[PDB]
Amino acid sequence: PQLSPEQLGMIEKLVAAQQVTPWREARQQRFAHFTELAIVSVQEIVDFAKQLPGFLQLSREDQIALLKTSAIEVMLLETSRRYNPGSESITFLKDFSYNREDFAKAGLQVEFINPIFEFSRAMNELQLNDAEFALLIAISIFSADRPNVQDQLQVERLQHTYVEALHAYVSIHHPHDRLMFPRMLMKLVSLRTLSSVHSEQVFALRLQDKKLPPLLSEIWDVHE
């Protein structure tokens, strides 16, 4: 698969599209600084999506359906992007690094933390660059199988243009390793499991005395 002018420019645009408080009252403040980073991330993901070709042409309702369920997956991709295999930690916003223990003290439970760190380690072995990251994020956003998506067909057709662009990219990036393109997609499989381990997480917070802030509650709390 040769990369086309049209794919070149699309990829370049995505990469360019990607370019808060202190750190048992200490406990509820630590949680708060962490949820604040997520809130920031949601804003970034919206801004990013708005730039994705095809996205704003979908009905607003469909844009909500897509972001609602992809946000955590994009957050997890962004987590694995800033993983350091030396210190087994996550470097959010230049300065503040976070290990499994820091995550625990930030209010998250072990049964979420370990899968987050396993995924990040496995993802770091692939050594993805920005172009690969942006595309995976885009593919994740445009999944036609999210709950309440109306124009599945359009969402799917859109996803495949990003899937193709990835294929052709990885062909220039890894011309001798034809497995790299499928290995990257196989991470979206793992990403779905992580997405529901995050559901078990959200539900467990309900059971303790820990309320998600407004935006996060809006995307993640099930309200009935």
Partner: peptide, 15 residues
């Protein structure tokens, strides 16, 4: 609709 249930997300999308 989802839109009526996701005000902050909607408002982020409108700016």
């Amino acid at each position: 609709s989802l839109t009526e249930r996701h005000k902050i997300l909607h408002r982020l999308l409108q700016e």
